[PDB]
Design an enzyme around this catalytic site. Structure first.
Site, PDB file in Angstrom:
ATOM      1  N   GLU A  54       1.136  -1.497   0.143  1.00  0.00           N
ATOM      2  CA  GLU A  54      -0.064  -0.264  -0.145  1.00  0.00           C
ATOM      3  C   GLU A  54       1.099   1.330   0.243  1.00  0.00           C
ATOM      4  OE1 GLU A  54      -4.107  -0.623   0.211  1.00  0.00           O
ATOM      5  OE2 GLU A  54      -3.124   0.851  -0.537  1.00  0.00           O
ATOM      6  N   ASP A  55       1.303   1.410  -0.906  1.00  0.00           N
ATOM      7  CA  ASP A  55       2.365   2.610  -1.790  1.00  0.00           C
ATOM      8  C   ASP A  55       3.415   2.201  -0.578  1.00  0.00           C
ATOM      9  OD1 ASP A  55       0.207   2.517  -3.668  1.00  0.00           O
ATOM     10  OD2 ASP A  55      -0.652   3.911  -1.836  1.00  0.00           O
ATOM     11  N   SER A  56       3.991   1.663  -0.394  1.00  0.00           N
ATOM     12  CA  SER A  56       5.538   1.542   1.032  1.00  0.00           C
ATOM     13  C   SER A  56       6.395   1.704  -0.109  1.00  0.00           C
ATOM     14  CB  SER A  56       4.959   1.698   2.179  1.00  0.00           C
ATOM     15  OG  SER A  56       6.106   1.565   3.155  1.00  0.00           O
TER      16      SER A  56
END
Ligand SMILES: [Zn+2]
Ligand SMILES: [Zn+2]
Ligand SMILES: [Zn+2]
Lengths: 51, 101, 1131, 117
Positions: free
Chosen positions: C759-761
């Site tokens: 999730e966007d990490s």
């Protein structure tokens, strides 16, 4: 809903002093076919026509 | 009714200059025109002068409780910013009810 | 002779480089300011009327000439020395130059006793100077000279320094003036409205808008009205025509209807005539106008005079404000009515509000001119009062004492300092957001802020039409760069070759049209206007012509030869409607294009040859424009242009699309702006991704400017090891991203590894971070000054002492010196003191007012600067230095909208490795790609692998058919790698191969300003606000987090009543009041003596204690202030 | 039928309004500013084309053939001059629903013939 404009092609006002001899030539047939018998008060007629 | 000092705290700046609240400035205007009207009724003043003074007192009280009156001029202060009346203190978002309660 | 396709990609970019060698990226700012100083100030001074004052003797005081010296700063001693911009930045001065005006005062009393006294160079004000402008001390300096002055040679300039703060004027959009625009509002009494914001050539008043509307159908027919200025009632157009001296209906329709063979126009104007027959003469019509006005004079004489003055001055000033212009005004108002009838008859399209051909960009020059007009008018007013109070006594006066120069100086300084564009008194009618603080976070942010446009529609407006990317923004505004918050589509950015016109006088064009076969408008008969073509110049219908085609040919030849017509003049021939509109005014956004012959470019190979040796034979862009090979085309002239996207479009094809092109793109990639021109392969991304990168390139760390060692900026981030991208576009060569890059090439692996990048990490390499990977330094500047404002209290820098200072915190002051200032190299932790300032009292005779560090920083003092501010007390700036090593929570981004925070950091032995022991610097999750469709990220990774293995820099220019994925894959397969960029990786923990071959390669990543350490915050019983005893707001104030209305609603849904009471009563503002049980009003309690009494009820026994929020007590008291009685009844 | 145009007085140059003479039972056009009168020759005072059957060929002008942005075709030669090339374009005019109709114009100079397929 249908108004007269939705079904109308074009309106015009003429100055027809006597319906017997109309301003337009193609409307002389049915106008005389209507006028040869008095259906309405011909005296209460106005020379302004709305075709 | 003039509220207490808690409702209009005089916040001290970095130095010693005590800045007063908008309510306090407005109450200063109200007391000024009230005293002015009191003397003008007590001593020599024309009827139109008293009328103008009463009109200005009305303007001050109205703009103390509600500053955004349509048509009327907004109660001004130094720097050209309008004062925050009691109504704007709790009118909507960031007011008392929505913003603090 | 012809440039062949194989050479084209060089030729075009050679041409582009020449452009950027000539112009730069902030040319619009500099040209605007230069025109303002060279022309606008002088025009404003001369356009002011001479102030004739007399009791008797009389004085005129005519201002005739201006002189703007170079920027200069004067010390207390009075020695004169030049002020450098860096000295202004450091000392918090204003980089301004003095404006002196020549004044001529002639004494005229009687008997021809005349004598003139001229005051040469009367100091009229100080004008702030845009950096790198002609009137800047950094003008024409070499890079060595700029470095000698501690200036960055890459600094574009284009901004002002007001009080040490770099301020940039944002170009403001506005509807163009002197042009008739026929719109149709759906919800209004009018069917069609034709407006014209009219403004004289040399502005002296606001835009006077005139409307000519048609009343919506439903007396008999559709009536045409005219909403004149300064008149609060609609006025029939026929009345206006008669008031201008045209009483006969024939004359009025001669002016309105140019083709008498057209009964449709006739019957549609007939209702207006039928409505105005009782009024038939000029005086009666003027009386009617005056009566309909908001100041109806009881006597018709002054009514008629007022109507005359309105119809001569406020109605259509651009047509002419002098007398005897009624013929031109009548022709123009008839043209407005004609345009309205054409719209109502369907013969013309309604005008598009969003068309940029209908808009103008109000730049620094025309904005400073608005300020200067207002301020000079105020100055002349003050001079009038001062001189009047002296001549009323019958004696001479000194104009030097009449001129209080603070008007112009403080006005311009205030307006540029705050951004409130207008007089300081009208601080609410003024429009803010002009003149923002220049963004110095990265070089791209500075360039973009200097090329920023603004649509002042208002962020509150929820109509999407002005926010939409209009078709006409092509080549003028970046399609991608725009804020994604509440100002989508309103804040815009120039495209790279976009040039905003600076303005020009129409005099040579009008003179040539006179010498040419144009016929003036007063000399013609209206019968000629039927077949003839109208000619408008800056909105004014000046005449008519008979062969518009060869007129346009002549004018285009003249503009391409740099003859009387300058390059920025727009010349639009509308053919279907026979107008020819010529524009010379400022604010017209345009762009350069290659002219096309029959089906060939005029850019032959000889031009490319001379451009290649640009540095020897001084053959520049201007020689390319003067050769008639390049042309600036504005948005409105693009409508008449047929563009070729590339010279390949000019080839004869099996089926010809156009075969009649007129221009060609220099390169389509020039439709992008500064921040979108850094995206590699932006045509392989979803467009929202390109917009998000264009926003995120501005928060990327790098080296924002070369001379960062001398700047005392409030906040500054410098990356330890900036790298130029391995995969670059050919536009960054002009953005100077290669000289001041803002990222690092990271070996990024797109993989699912341990789940810490979901999730966007991202997962970063701890070993790489140990080696200086994405390490930065954070510089924070604190300012302080000791004020000796008066003998009552004076501040002073000195090491405080526990025995004399009163408000002295428990923090130790040992790090300070006897001067009260910390020394460089001293390690300072949170809450520490850097400046020891003490203020004399009225813990005796001095109180501590020291400057602490912003809490929880833990830096080292980088340097300390001491100087004197404008007034001249001691002034200190301390720059503290804090090394920011990337960590979990720091935000990173690629150039494709792929942002994410560091989830975890693994050491090199914990990261996955290739057969040759390469570990990824970053690991990002594959799930960030599919929904986003950032294929440019993958192509950039593959191209970067090829570039690193080949020893080159990849070409990721957007529209390049010589570079596709198959070529890159074939190249990569030649270096012993899987052609698609995959590799077998091994698990770092176990060493086993990963079943799925991972996609890994160099990608340019950016470290963004948003580090977690600047965001983490906690509170447990800290300080509270004064008014309502609730936690403060902000990290800096040690404030509490807001438990808002939505949180209240969520906890109500949960049913958690005690938690809700804890959050909204006990953790915010617990309080107690004493209430009278009878009247329910807060009583008076005295808990020390235990005496509780209500003055209202005169009781002291029936009082009750109530536990309520302090905000509720404050509410009830503010209601009692309003005469409301909120009675808290406990029974 | 055809439309009716406005006609102006010969003295005051104001528009002549319609009037009826009962004495001769005849239409007259008289000015309500001066005292002029005229014997009408059309006998029709008002015409409304609700259908809006307008020949858009009359609205076109030959000068549009000089537009570089219009498409050109060699497939529709000119009937008046025999030129091969011709520009074509759609009505793009309000009050015309069936506006996909193409109008052609001859690009030969000084011919400027316009037509429709
Ligand atoms: Zn009581
Ligand atoms: Zn007449
Ligand atoms: Zn032809």
């Amino acid at each position: 809903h249908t108004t007269l404009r939705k079904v109308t092609a074009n309106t015009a006002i003429y100055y027809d002093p006597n319906p017997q001899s109309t301003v337009v030539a193609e409307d002389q047939e049915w106008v005389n076919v209507y006028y040869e018998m008095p259906d309405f008060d011909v005296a209460r007629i106005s020379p302004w026509l709305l075709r | 009714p003039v509220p207490p000092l808690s409702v209009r705290p005089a916040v001290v700046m970095q130095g010693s200059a005590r800045n007063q609240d908008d309510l306090t400035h407005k109450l200063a205007d109200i007391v000024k025109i009230n005293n002015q009207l009191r003397r003008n009724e007590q001593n020599g003043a024309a009827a139109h002068v008293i009328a103008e003074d009463v009109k200005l007192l009305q303007f001050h009280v109205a703009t103390m409780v509600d500053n955004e009156l349509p048509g009327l001029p907004r109660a001004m202060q130094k720097s050209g910013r309008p004062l925050k009346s009691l109504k704007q203190r709790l009118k909507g978002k960031e007011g008392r009810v929505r913003g603090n309660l | 002779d012809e440039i062949t396709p194989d050479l084209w990609q060089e030729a075009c970019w050679i041409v582009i480089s020449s452009y950027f060698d000539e112009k730069g990226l902030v040319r619009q700012q500099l040209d605007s300011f230069d025109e303002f100083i060279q022309m606008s100030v002088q025009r404003i001074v001369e356009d002011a009327p001479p102030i004739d004052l007399q009791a008797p003797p009389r004085y005129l005081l005519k201002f005739e000439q201006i002189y703007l010296s170079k920027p200069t700063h004067w010390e207390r001693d009075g020695a004169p020395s030049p002020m450098m911009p860096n000295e202004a930045r450091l000392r918090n001065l204003t980089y301004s130059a003095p404006l002196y005006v020549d004044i001529t005062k002639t004494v005229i009393k009687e008997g021809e006793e005349q004598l003139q006294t001229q005051h040469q160079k009367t100091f009229i004000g100080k004008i702030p100077i845009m950096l790198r402008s002609t009137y800047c001390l950094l003008n024409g300096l070499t890079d060595r000279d700029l470095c000698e002055l501690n200036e960055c040679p890459l600094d574009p300039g284009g901004y002002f320094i007001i009080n040490g703060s770099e301020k940039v004027l944002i170009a403001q959009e506005k509807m163009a003036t002197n042009t008739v625009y026929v719109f149709a509002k759906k919800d209004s009494k009018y069917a069609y409205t034709g407006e014209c914001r009219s403004c004289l050539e040399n502005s002296s008043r606001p835009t006077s808008t005139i409307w000519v509307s048609m009343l919506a159908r439903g007396a008999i027919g559709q009536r045409i009205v005219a909403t004149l200025p300064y008149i609060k009632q609609e006025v029939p157009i026929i009345i206006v025509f008669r008031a201008l001296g045209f009483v006969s209906d024939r004359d009025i329709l001669e002016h309105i209807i140019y083709d008498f063979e057209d009964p449709e126009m006739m019957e549609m104007v007939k209702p207006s005539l039928d409505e105005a027959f009782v009024i038939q003469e000029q005086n009666v019509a003027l009386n009617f106008i005056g009566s309909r006005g908001a100041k109806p004079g009881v006597t018709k004489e002054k009514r008629i005079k007022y109507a005359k003055e309105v119809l001569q001055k406020e109605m259509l000033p651009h047509v002419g404000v002098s007398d005897f212009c009624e013929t031109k005004k009548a022709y123009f108002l008839g043209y407005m009515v004609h345009r309205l009838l054409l719209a109502a008859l369907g013969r013309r399209e309604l005008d598009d509000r969003d068309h940029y051909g209908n808009k103008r960009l109000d730049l620094a020059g025309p904005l400073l001119a608005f300020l200067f007009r207002g301020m000079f008018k105020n100055l002349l007013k003050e001079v009038r009062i001062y001189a009047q109070k002296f001549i009323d006594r019958g004696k001479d006066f000194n104009l030097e004492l009449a001129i209080k120069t603070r008007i112009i100086s403080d006005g311009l300084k205030y307006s540029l300092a705050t951004g409130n564009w207008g007089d300081q008194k009208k601080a609410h009618q003024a429009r803010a957001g002009v003149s923002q603080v220049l963004n110095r976070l990265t070089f791209a942010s500075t360039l973009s802020h200097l090329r920023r446009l603004n649509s002042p529609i208002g962020r509150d407006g929820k109509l999407a039409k002005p926010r939409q990317l209009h078709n006409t923004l092509w080549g003028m505004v970046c399609p991608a760069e725009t804020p994604e918050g509440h100002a989508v589509g309103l804040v815009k950015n120039l495209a790279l070759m976009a040039y905003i016109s600076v303005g020009s006088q129409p005099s040579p064009i009008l003179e040539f049209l006179e010498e040419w076969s144009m016929e003036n408008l007063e000399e013609i008969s209206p019968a000629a206007i039927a077949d003839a073509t109208k000619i408008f110049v800056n909105g004014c219908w000046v005449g008519i012509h008979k062969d518009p085609e060869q007129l346009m040919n002549t004018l285009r030849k003249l503009r391409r030869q740099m003859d009387i017509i300058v390059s920025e003049v727009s010349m639009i021939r509308d053919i279907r409607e026979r107008e020819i509109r010529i524009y010379t005014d400022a604010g017209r956004i345009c762009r350069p294009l290659l002219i096309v012959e029959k089906q060939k470019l005029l850019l032959k190979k000889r031009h490319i040859d001379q451009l290649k040796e640009r540095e020897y034979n001084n053959y520049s862009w201007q020689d390319l424009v003067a050769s008639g090979v390049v042309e600036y085309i504005d948005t409105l002239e693009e409508e008449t242009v047929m563009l070729a996207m590339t010279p390949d479009d000019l080839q004869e094809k099996e089926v010809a699309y156009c075969s009649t092109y007129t221009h060609c793109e220099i390169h389509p990639s020039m439709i992008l702006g500064v921040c979108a021109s850094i995206i590699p392969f932006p045509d392989h991304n979803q467009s929202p991704r390109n917009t998000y990168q264009s926003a995120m390139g501005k928060q990327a760390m790098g080296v924002y400017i070369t001379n960062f060692h001398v700047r005392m900026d409030t906040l500054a981030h410098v990356l330890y090891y900036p790298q130029k991208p391995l995969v670059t576009t050919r536009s960054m060569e002009y953005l100077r991203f290669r000289e001041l890059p803002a990222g690092i090439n990271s070996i990024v692996a797109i993989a699912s590894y341990t789940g810490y990048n979901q999730e966007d990490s991202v997962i970063m390499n701890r070993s790489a971070v140990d080696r200086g990977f994405f390490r930065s330094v954070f510089y924070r500047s604190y300012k302080e000054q000791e004020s000796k404002k008066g003998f009552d209290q004076e501040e002073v820098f000195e090491k405080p002492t526990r025995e004399t200072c009163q408000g002295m915190r428990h923090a130790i002051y040992d790090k300070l010196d006897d001067d009260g200032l910390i020394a460089p190299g001293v390690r300072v932790s949170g809450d520490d003191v850097i400046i020891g300032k003490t203020v004399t009292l009225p813990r005796y005779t001095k109180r501590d007012c020291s400057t602490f560090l912003r809490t929880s920083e833990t830096g080292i003092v980088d340097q300390v600067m001491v100087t004197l501010n404008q007034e001249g007390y001691k002034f200190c700036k301390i720059r503290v230095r804090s090394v920011r090593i990337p960590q979990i929570g720091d935000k990173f981004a690629s150039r494709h909208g792929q942002k994410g925070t560091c989830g975890i950091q693994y050491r090199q032995e914990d990261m996955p490795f290739t057969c040759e022991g390469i570990t990824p610097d970053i690991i990002i999750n594959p799930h960030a790609i599919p929904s986003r469709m950032t294929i440019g990220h993958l192509i950039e990774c593959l191209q970067g692998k090829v570039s690193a293995n080949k020893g080159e820099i990849g070409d990721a220019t957007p529209f390049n058919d010589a570079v596709n994925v198959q070529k890159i894959s074939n190249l990569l397969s030649d270096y012993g790698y899987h052609l698609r960029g995959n590799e077998v990786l091994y698990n770092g923990f176990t060493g086993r191969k990963i079943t799925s071959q991972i996609f890994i390669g160099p990608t340019y990543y950016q470290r963004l300003k948003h580090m977690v350490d600047d965001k983490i915050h906690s509170r447990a019983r800290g300080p509270i606000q004064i008014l309502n005893r609730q936690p403060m707001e902000g990290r800096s104030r040690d404030g509490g987090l807001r438990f808002g209305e939505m949180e209240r609603d969520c906890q109500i849904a949960h049913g958690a009543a005690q938690f809700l009471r804890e959050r909204l009563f006990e953790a915010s503002d617990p309080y107690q009041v004493h209430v009278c049980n009878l009247c329910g009003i807060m009583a008076i309690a005295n808990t020390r003596t235990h005496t509780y009494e209500c003055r209202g009820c005169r009781n002291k026994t029936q009082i009750s204690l109530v536990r309520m929020p302090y905000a509720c007590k404050l509410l009830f008291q503010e209601l009692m202030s309003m005469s409301i009685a909120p009675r808290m009844m406990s029974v | 039928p055809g439309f009716v145009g406005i006609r102006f007085c010969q003295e005051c140059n104001n528009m002549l309004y319609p009037k009826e003479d009962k004495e001769n039972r005849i239409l007259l056009y008289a000015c309500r500013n001066c005292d002029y009168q005229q014997e009408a020759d059309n006998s029709c005072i008002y015409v409304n084309k609700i259908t809006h059957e307008v020949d858009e060929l009359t609205q076109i002008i030959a000068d549009v053939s000089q537009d570089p942005t219009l498409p050109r075709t060699e497939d529709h030669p000119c009937q008046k001059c025999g030129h091969k090339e011709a520009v074509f374009f759609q009505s793009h005019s309000a009050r015309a629903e069936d506006a996909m109709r193409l109008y052609y114009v001859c690009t030969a100079p000084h011919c400027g013939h316009r037509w429709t397929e």
